[PDB]
Amino acid sequence: AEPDHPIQLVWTDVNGRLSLDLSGAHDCFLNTRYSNYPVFILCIIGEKRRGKSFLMNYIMRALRSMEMDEEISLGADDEPLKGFKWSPGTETTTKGIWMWNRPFLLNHKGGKIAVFLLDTEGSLDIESDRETCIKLSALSLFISSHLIFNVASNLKETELDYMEMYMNMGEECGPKNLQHLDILVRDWYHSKKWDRDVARSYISREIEKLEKLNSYPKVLWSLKSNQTRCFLLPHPGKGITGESEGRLQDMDEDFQESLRSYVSKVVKGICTHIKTNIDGELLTSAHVFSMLQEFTEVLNLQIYGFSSPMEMFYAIKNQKLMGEIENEFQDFLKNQSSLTLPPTMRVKVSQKFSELLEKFMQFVQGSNTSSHDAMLKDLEVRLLEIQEKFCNDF
Amino acid sequence: AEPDHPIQLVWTDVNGRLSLDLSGAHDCFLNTRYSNYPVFILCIIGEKRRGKSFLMNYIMRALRSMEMDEEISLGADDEPLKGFKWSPGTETTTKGIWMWNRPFLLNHKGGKIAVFLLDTEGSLDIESDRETCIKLSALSLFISSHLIFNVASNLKETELDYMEMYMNMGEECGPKNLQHLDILVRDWYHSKKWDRDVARSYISREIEKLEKLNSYPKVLWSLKSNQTRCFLLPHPGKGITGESEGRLQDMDEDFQESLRSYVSKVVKGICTHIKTNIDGELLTSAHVFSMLQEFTEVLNLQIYGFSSPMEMFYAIKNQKLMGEIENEFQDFLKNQSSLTLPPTMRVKVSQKFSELLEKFMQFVQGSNTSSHDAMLKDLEVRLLEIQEKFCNDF
């Protein structure tokens, strides 16, 4: 891995675990040319297949322009788009979390700021375990000093559902600890009315909707805070979504106009979003990896069981059914006469035990046989404990 | 309500209940001019704000063209779009289920087919209870003889999650009973490659992805069946998504090309998708409302508790916690010595009771105080039963 390429910072394994590259990425942060500079860490997350990597590449152009001339540019109109791997169509491209393997070094107050870029696998891909992508997105949220939440078309149930999940991934991910959040709405319906004042009005209206709900207290906090802003990009047009070199000349003109404005605002805000540690001191490059490591271990400790809404519905109902059957067993035991002889008692209890296993299987919901078996096995061990204790003391 | 207007067939009330219009809609189906004709029932469902009503209006043009001349047309290029109420932007428009208040009468085998159109509130709107919209979409699915599942951009976790839910809303909604399903992908990334052969290839690839999963057996069944097809529409362009009259001339040319092809295929298939009853006989107009009524009562009987993924996660964990605490109480009672005097026993049990209520509140997850109180109240009644039984028998 040579300089000026993306490198994979985080990947997930089979067991659902998140692993950091403790060699190449770790070495990227500790380079003595810039390890003591204050850092700005830009991360992008959001739904799959919506130009996240594409956008990070145009930000990279502006950072490289600023690194050279102190000047803001998105390149020449015929420059094809390079950087983080980006690709058209329905197949997903980014997996895990990638970073550019060198910072971009911007002038700031007679020193430098080291700017790091993190590109995350998009959500809603069914070939990826949804909890795994949730953990990846929360790790990006945690480490960011500027987080881009890339949203398709408009804020909907899905985006609010997911960002509420992200901000519940430990106290570290709560909205108060999120330094800066851009809610970037891609493919905005209005190609002419997308400016800063439209976006404030749109968020104010969303807050009205959220104030009526119970579901999204953490997102609501964030949206009401001075740490969250919304930007709107119109649709880029068919010269960008099909087979494309990603060139500025391929862009719909209103998309290019909003893109230039948005990228320029990101770059110009960098000096106001230097990454901070727990205590609020400026964080340097040399301490980012430590933070990544500790919070990755936090995320790998807890298994949530996020799944399809129907699977979680069946899980609630089936867990209620198991508890009902256990209580049924307990009530049956309490109702037995202490004057029954021990051998006759043992038979009666065993028959009830078998009858309740059959009842579980008669009322269990869903069709995942493997999970029915796990649940049945678990019910069986718990009833056996109850039986043993009763028949030994009886 | 006069003829040639939309009328609301189904609405939801505060208590989450679905109500049918038993007067106007009921009278629409039983009109003696067409109540004995076989019916075709087209229903559209899917995510909010994605041109569902808009599409149903262009289908209406083609039906009205066919009703008049036996000829297929989408109108003149400058005709503004009328019919079901449709509107740009982020605010939702269709609520409940609407129908056109007259059938369109198509020639068929020396008789007529009565064509009914049902337009459904889109999913993912946070001002609507998600279970309520799920029930509305399942009712549309149940009654359809041609169902349009309108999908934004591509099949993702969300669409598969929701259609799996729809097809679990009673045996009536299972994939085997779904006469015909179009998965209509709007805003398809490729403006040139969207034809029937691309869509088959796309679905075949999705089936490969689903074959690896446990989550979507019912969708998988449907996609593998001969009763489900996929059609792709490119993006209509900014002359349709902004302030628009919805005219053919406002359309991107590749969108208009796919739209004409798709609408023509829908209308030409009508004779092959006559609605059928349980036994497979042709259903007439005069019996549609009966079916609507019976299945609406089925849907109003069951309350699922669908909610945000974080809320369902907390619900699973909190329900497990309540069961753990109840078992803790039961084990404590079993471990008590029968030689303890009754008054001393009653105090010991009461103190454990209080200690376990405190434990519940110490470990309960989430921040919905109202639901914590409900759960605490419920735990308290169950422990009281256990206590009463123990202290009376002791």
Ligand SMILES: Nc1nc2c(ncn2[C@@H]2O[C@H](COP(=O)(O)OP(=O)(O)O)[C@@H](O)[C@H]2O)c(=O)[nH]1
């Ligand atoms: N619909 C849409 N597509 C975009 C946008 N920006 C870029 N694209 C295209 O989206 C496709 C996926 O881009 P990519 O960056 O790989 O998506 P990612 O999975 O979000 O990282 C490419 O064909 C891009 O050119 C946008 O604003 N809207």
Ligand SMILES: Nc1nc2c(ncn2[C@@H]2O[C@H](COP(=O)(O)OP(=O)(O)O)[C@@H](O)[C@H]2O)c(=O)[nH]1
């Ligand atoms: N992005 C997109 N917008 C569309 C399409 N077709 C129509 N629209 C626009 O979407 C907006 C919402 O249309 P509407 O029919 O009310 O949406 P509905 O809530 O799905 O019924 C209107 O401005 C339409 O002109 C499409 O294929 N893609």
Ligand code: ALF
């Ligand atoms: F779908 Al992606 F990066 F979110 F390829």
Ligand code: ALF
């Ligand atoms: F958002 Al809609 F009909 F689905 F207005």
Ligand SMILES: [Mg+2]
């Ligand atoms: Mg990407």
Ligand SMILES: [Mg+2]
């Ligand atoms: Mg912070």
Ligand SMILES: [Mg+2]
């Ligand atoms: Mg509508």
Ligand SMILES: [Mg+2]
């Ligand atoms: Mg059927």
